[PDB]
Design a protein around this ligand. Structure first.
Ligand SMILES: CC[C@@H](CO)NCCN[C@@H](CC)CO
Length: 131
């Protein structure tokens, strides 16, 4: 599955861009997770953080979550609680994968995770976000 010459494999944390939305964090999943169909060549099933829905998205409309500063939308973050919730769930997954720990509102748990992400996911850097 996903042998089409494009990047992103199962478990990869990504930003996904679907028409009419900010870049949104997601995880690349197997089509078997979706209960739908195999993805067309050149596409990936992703599951969006925050709402848990599945979309078939072109691999060219995906970027690594680790490219964080570049794709994080501060306006969307300020405007939408659903986006903030998505960030939390996405960064929590990132955090556990990287072996990272932080020292309790949504915005308060989020604060150091966001700082971590925005700052480059130190000390591991983005290699720590790998599945
Ligand atoms: C319209 C409902 C809102 C709240 O979850 N969706 C947030 C955006 N996430 C969708 C688009 C990336 C994925 O369904």
């Amino acid at each position: 599955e996903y042998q089409d010459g494009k990047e992103f494999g199962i478990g990869d944390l990504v930003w996904g861009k679907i028409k009419g939305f900010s870049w949104w964090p997601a995880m690349v999943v197997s089509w078997k997770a979706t209960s739908k169909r195999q993805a067309m060549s050149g596409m990936r099933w992703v599951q969006w953080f925050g709402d848990g829905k599945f979309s078939e998205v072109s691999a060219d409309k995906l970027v690594a979550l680790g490219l964080f500063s570049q794709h994080f939308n501060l306006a969307t973050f300020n405007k939408l609680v659903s986006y903030r919730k998505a960030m939390y769930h996405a960064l929590e997954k990132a955090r556990v994968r990287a072996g990272k720990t932080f020292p309790d509102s949504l915005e308060d748990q989020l604060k150091p995770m966001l700082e971590w992400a925005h700052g480059g996911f130190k000390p591991t850097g983005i290699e720590g976000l790998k599945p």
